[PDB]
Scaffold this motif. Structure first.
Motif, PDB file in Angstrom:
ATOM      1  N   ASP A  98       0.987 -48.668  20.241  1.00 57.57           N
ATOM      2  CA  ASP A  98       0.620 -47.291  19.898  1.00 57.57           C
ATOM      3  C   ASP A  98       0.259 -47.188  18.412  1.00 57.57           C
ATOM      4  O   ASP A  98      -0.685 -46.479  18.056  1.00 57.57           O
ATOM      5  N   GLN A  99       0.958 -47.917  17.536  1.00 55.91           N
ATOM      6  CA  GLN A  99       0.624 -47.932  16.116  1.00 55.91           C
ATOM      7  C   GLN A  99      -0.767 -48.542  15.934  1.00 55.91           C
ATOM      8  O   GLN A  99      -1.633 -47.896  15.358  1.00 55.91           O
ATOM      9  N   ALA A 100      -1.021 -49.737  16.474  1.00 60.97           N
ATOM     10  CA  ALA A 100      -2.316 -50.410  16.376  1.00 60.97           C
ATOM     11  C   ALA A 100      -3.470 -49.557  16.941  1.00 60.97           C
ATOM     12  O   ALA A 100      -4.567 -49.546  16.386  1.00 60.97           O
ATOM     13  N   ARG A 101      -3.216 -48.787  18.006  1.00 57.64           N
ATOM     14  CA  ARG A 101      -4.203 -47.877  18.606  1.00 57.64           C
ATOM     15  C   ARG A 101      -4.485 -46.692  17.676  1.00 57.64           C
ATOM     16  O   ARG A 101      -5.632 -46.275  17.541  1.00 57.64           O
ATOM     17  N   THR A 102      -3.455 -46.183  17.003  1.00 62.54           N
ATOM     18  CA  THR A 102      -3.563 -45.061  16.053  1.00 62.54           C
ATOM     19  C   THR A 102      -4.207 -45.506  14.738  1.00 62.54           C
ATOM     20  O   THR A 102      -4.961 -44.760  14.122  1.00 62.54           O
ATOM     21  N   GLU A 103      -3.986 -46.757  14.334  1.00 61.40           N
ATOM     22  CA  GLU A 103      -4.556 -47.367  13.128  1.00 61.40           C
ATOM     23  C   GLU A 103      -6.097 -47.380  13.169  1.00 61.40           C
ATOM     24  O   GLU A 103      -6.754 -47.423  12.125  1.00 61.40           O
ATOM     25  N   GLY A 104      -6.668 -47.266  14.378  1.00 68.42           N
ATOM     26  CA  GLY A 104      -8.101 -47.219  14.673  1.00 68.42           C
ATOM     27  C   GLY A 104      -8.826 -46.004  14.084  1.00 68.42           C
ATOM     28  O   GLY A 104     -10.044 -45.907  14.203  1.00 68.42           O
ATOM     29  N   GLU A 105      -8.123 -45.085  13.413  1.00 69.28           N
ATOM     30  CA  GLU A 105      -8.732 -43.949  12.703  1.00 69.28           C
ATOM     31  C   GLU A 105      -9.743 -44.453  11.655  1.00 69.28           C
ATOM     32  O   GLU A 105     -10.671 -43.740  11.280  1.00 69.28           O
ATOM     33  N   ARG A 106      -9.590 -45.707  11.203  1.00 70.91           N
ATOM     34  CA  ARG A 106     -10.435 -46.397  10.216  1.00 70.91           C
ATOM     35  C   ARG A 106     -11.905 -46.456  10.625  1.00 70.91           C
ATOM     36  O   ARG A 106     -12.760 -46.556   9.753  1.00 70.91           O
ATOM     37  N   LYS A 122     -13.533 -43.983  11.343  1.00 71.22           N
ATOM     38  CA  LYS A 122     -14.019 -42.759  10.684  1.00 71.22           C
ATOM     39  C   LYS A 122     -13.452 -42.598   9.272  1.00 71.22           C
ATOM     40  O   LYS A 122     -14.234 -42.426   8.341  1.00 71.22           O
ATOM     41  N   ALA A 123     -12.144 -42.772   9.090  1.00 72.69           N
ATOM     42  CA  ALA A 123     -11.442 -42.640   7.808  1.00 72.69           C
ATOM     43  C   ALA A 123     -11.926 -43.599   6.706  1.00 72.69           C
ATOM     44  O   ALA A 123     -11.834 -43.272   5.527  1.00 72.69           O
ATOM     45  N   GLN A 124     -12.430 -44.781   7.074  1.00 68.82           N
ATOM     46  CA  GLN A 124     -12.919 -45.788   6.126  1.00 68.82           C
ATOM     47  C   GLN A 124     -14.225 -46.437   6.627  1.00 68.82           C
ATOM     48  O   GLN A 124     -14.465 -47.632   6.456  1.00 68.82           O
TER      49      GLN A 124
END
Lengths: 52, 52
Positions: A40-48, A50-52
């Motif tokens: 779930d952390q690795a899936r949420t880390e995927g904001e990158r 758009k975020a980066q």
């Protein structure tokens, strides 16, 4: 009393088998939780994307 | 004869009674001492064994 002592030792013996089994069962349950939280952390880390 | 007549009868009788008792009367009763002593000794060993 010696015959009764073998039965009492038999209770401590079966309790030790069960308690040791639960200690290892809880460890496997904890291990499964750690991997699920990492997914779930690795899936949420995927904001990158758009975020980066 | 006043006193000398008993010298031969007792010598044979004593030697017979001792050898006869030693083979057919004494052995069956003395074995029980080894047994009676062991009945207590096994009980004392059981107390140390149960604790161990």
């Amino acid at each position: 009393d010696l015959e009764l002592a073998h039965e009492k030792a038999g209770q401590q013996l079966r309790e030790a088998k069960a308690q040791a089994a639960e200690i290892v069962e809880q460890a496997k349950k904890r291990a499964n939780q750690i991997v699920d939280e990492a997914r779930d952390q690795a899936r949420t880390e995927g904001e990158r994307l758009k975020a980066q | 004869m006043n006193i000398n007549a008993t010298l031969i009868g007792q010598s044979v009788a004593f030697f017979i009674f001792v050898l006869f008792c030693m083979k057919f009367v004494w052995p069956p009763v003395i074995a029980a001492l080894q047994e009676r002593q062991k009945k207590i000794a096994d009980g004392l060993d059981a107390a140390n064994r149960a604790a161990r």
